[PDB]
Every structure is written in C-alpha cells, then in structure tokens.
Amino acid sequence: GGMLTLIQGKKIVNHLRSRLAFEYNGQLIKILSKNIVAVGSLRREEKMLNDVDLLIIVPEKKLLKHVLPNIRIKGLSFSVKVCGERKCVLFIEWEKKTYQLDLFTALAEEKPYAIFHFTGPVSYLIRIRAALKKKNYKLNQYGLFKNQTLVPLKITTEKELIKELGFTYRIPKKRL
Amino acid sequence: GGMLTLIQGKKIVNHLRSRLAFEYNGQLIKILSKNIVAVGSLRREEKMLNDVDLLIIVPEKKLLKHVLPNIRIKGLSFSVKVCGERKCVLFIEWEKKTYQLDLFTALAEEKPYAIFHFTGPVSYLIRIRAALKKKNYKLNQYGLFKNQTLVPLKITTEKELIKELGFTYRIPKKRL
DNA sequence: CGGATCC
DNA sequence: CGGATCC
Ligand SMILES: Nc1nc(=O)c2ncn([C@H]3C[C@H](O)[C@@H](CO[P@@](=O)([SeH])OP(=O)(O)O)O3)c2[nH]1
Ligand SMILES: [Mg+2]
Ligand SMILES: [Mg+2]
Ligand SMILES: [Mg+2]
Ligand SMILES: [Mg+2]
C-alpha cells in the first residue's frame, strides 16, 4: 500500500465512519461511528501516513469472533492481507490508488487501554512500559496488570488512565 | 494462493532449482540447486499442498540481509506478501493460477536443525519439543539449547540429529 | 513448541 | 514493551 497525506487519511476515515459493518450469522450489523476511533500516526497528526489505523469498540466478547473476520465496507474495493479477531489488515482502493487500512478491536472495558496503545508512538510506549515494569506492573492494550492479574482502575477515558498511571498527559501529536 | 497437487508442487520446485537468485549490491548471485531443500508438506509427500516450502542454505551470515529481501526468480511472475531475512512468502503465477511459495533461510551450521524444523509436521515438532523441554532443553530451527546456551552436537545430517536427540528416525512421510 | 514478521 | 497472526 502507498503513502498517504494527513488530509487523505482524514477523508478516508470520514468516508468509512458510516460504511463499516460485519456479517453475524447471515445478518449485516452496522458498526456505529461512536465505536470507531482513529488511532496510530493519523491521530498523532503526522503529515504523511504509512497507513490508516482504526480501532473498533466491540460491545460484547462473543462478537469478537465475528467482527473483523466478517468485516464489510459499503461501496469500497478492498482485499484482506491478514485477519483475525483482534487485527485485520486490508488493502483498499481509494481514488485509483491502493492504501493499507489497519483495523483493530477493543472491548468496552479495554477502550482507554486500547486507545493509549494504538495511539503510540512506539518509542513512547516502550519508555512508559519500561518504567511501569520496574514497579512490577505490565501495561498492554487490554489493561494494567500486576502478577498476571488485572488491576481494576476506576477510569473511563485515556486522559484518566495516563494520569492514574503516574505520567504527564500530552496530546497525541506531542507524545514521544 | 490456491491448492496444489504433489506432482504440481514437484514440477514447481524442479523449475525453481535453476532459476533462484538474489541481488547483492547490484550483482545477481545465483542460488545453487544443492543449497535448495524442499521442506514442509511437499517433503512429507502429502497428496495436496496448501503451498510450496523451500529452505535456502546461505553460506555466510553477512548474506542473510541480502538473500530473501532481494530474491529473484528468472522468468516467473510473483509478488511479495511478507519478507525478512529468515522468512519470505511469495505468491507466484504458474500456468493460469496463483500459488503460495514459502522461502526460508538457514546458515550451514543450522542446516540439520532447519531441515528437521521445516519438515514438520507441527504436531510432531510439538511432541518432540515438549519431551526435550522436560529435560531442560530447547530445540529450534537454529540449534539445541540448554540454559540459553548452544549445545554443540557433533552432527552433520538430519538423521544424525534425530538419533542424537534420543528419538526414532522416521522418513518425512511417516512423522506424526 | 518455538520463532518471524508485523502491529 | 507487549501482543497478533502466521510459519
Ligand atoms: N515449531 C513449529 N511451530 C509451528 O507452529 C509451525 N508451523 C509451521 N512450522 C514448520 C513446519 C512446517 O512443515 C513448515 C512449513 O509451514 P506450513 O504452515 Se507451509 O506447514 P506444512 O502444512 O506442513 O507445509 O514450517 C512450524 N514449526
Ligand atoms: Mg499507522
Ligand atoms: Mg497500521
Ligand atoms: Mg507448507
Ligand atoms: Mg509454507
């Protein structure tokens, strides 16, 4: 897939917001715009993008086997490179050029952890995770853990998570 | 990529044996037939194949960065799905149809370990590796290890390795 | 079972 | 740093 500008990326996401769905035992189920979050370098507002990253919030655990493996995009040509329940990489046709669209799934209880992880950048995550690791924690896209056990934080948003973990909140574009 | 018969697989490999090369800083370097080993289900003589698996023996460590990342196949149309120094998955055109060709690299000192690993089947490797793990060993495609340290076995062929590890030698078709 | 490539 | 999907 080719490289994209920030504006092209934003246009693609806007187009996708009303056109994503999945087939669930023969029933086409629309994915709601409020359950679609732009993540990756697009959310970080980088000028050129290697691809478009979208996080899909899935309301029930039982649906994970169905959402990405039966993804549908109304009116857009695409093919599937790799796909499972948690990551699906698509090549899409947009204005006669091919681009990479990366789809990820999070459960509702994972959402802020997923947003934080998929926003990156990678260097920033490594640093954050290394610091938490010194205190016997493990942070991933699913939660904060200690001794392989979920640490139940009383948080809803990404901003609350970042502050609860003991770090300075920064807007996605200023994370490093 | 589509499914193949064993005889189609054998025909593809035969065709490839004289046509594989890599570009090394602008220089086309032929890969020799003696350094190309059929592995996977093809070596196990299964009647249908999901793909063709080839192991390429690379004579120097410095070449690993060049071989698969600059692979060339004379006269054959192909595209690259994923590729690094150790695994490269290609989709090739053969007669009217697209098939998957999986390429792997081993260094000369790894060869018997690589052949054993890439022959499979997976179930057989799991069983073998589980048994070795009980005795505090780790077996992979690169060597036999204990406490993260290479166990220098005095072996050259796959048959010698299998017997040295304490298992019954079986021909690839009879491994399970 | 264990590793490669990719996110 | 940590995990997904694939070999
Ligand atoms: N240790 C180990 N774990 C695995 O999951 C695994 N998957 C594949 N392989 C090795 C053995 C296979 O014969 C070879 C080629 O990969 P394929 O998926 Se084309 O398997 P095959 O159907 O046997 O041709 O790589 C594996 N080896
Ligand atoms: Mg991206
Ligand atoms: Mg991406
Ligand atoms: Mg195979
Ligand atoms: Mg294969």
Author numbering:
A (entry chain A), B (entry chain B): -1 to 174
Sentences from the paper on this structure:
To capture the reaction at the post-polymerization state, we designed and applied the crystallization droplets containing dGTPαSe-Rp, DNA-II, and Pol X. Surprisingly, we found that in one asymmetric unit, there was one substrate complex and three product complexes, including two DNA duplexes with four enzyme molecules. In other words, in the unit cell, the phosphoryl transfer reaction took place in three product complexes, whereas the last one was trapped in a transition-like state, where the incoming dGTPαSe-Rp paired with 5′-dC of the template strand. In the substrate complex, though two Me2+ ions at the active center coordinated with the incoming dGTPαSe-Rp, the phosphoryl transfer reaction did not occur, indicated by the clear density gap between the primer 3′-OH and the substrate α-phosphorus. Interestingly, the unexpected transition-like state complex revealed the in-line attacking SN2 mechanism in the phosphoryl-transfer polymerization, where with the attacking of the 3′-OH on the α-P center, a new bond was formed and the pyrophosphate was left. To catalyze the reaction, two Me2+ ions coordinated with the 3′-OH and the incoming dGTPαSe-Rp, whereas MeA interacted with the 3′-OH and Se atom and brought them together for the bond formation. The distance (3.3 Å) between the 3′-OH and the α-P atom was shorter than the relaxed distance (4.1 Å) provided in the literature, indicating the readiness state of the nucleophile for attacking. On the basis of the local structure (the trigonal bipyramid-like geometry) and the transition-like state, the attacking 3′-OH formed the hydrogen bond with the substrate 5′-O (indicated by their 2.8 Å distance), which facilitated the 3′-OH attacking and the phosphodiester bond formation. When compared to the structure of the native product complex, the Se-modified product complex (formed from dGTPαSe-Rp) generated extra and strong electron density only for the Se atom on the P-center, revealing its Sp configuration and indicating the two-metal Se coordination.
To provide a molecular basis for designing better drugs targeting polymerases, African swine fever virus DNA Polymerase X (Pol X) was used as a model for the study. As the simplest DNA polymerase identified to date, Pol X belongs to the polymerase X family and is constituted of 174 amino acids. In this chemical reaction, metal-ion A (MeA) is a catalytic ion and decreases the pKa of 3′-OH, facilitating its attack on the α-phosphate of the incoming dNTP, and metal-ion B (MeB) stabilizes the dNTP-DNA-polymerase complex and increases the electrophilicity of the phosphorus center. To clearly understand the phosphodiester-bond-formation mechanism and the metal-ion catalysis of polymerases, we designed modified dNTP substrates with a chiral α-phosphorus center (α-P center) using a single selenium atom, without affecting the overall and local structures, to explore the absolute configuration inversion and probe the mechanisms of the metal ion–oxygen interactions.
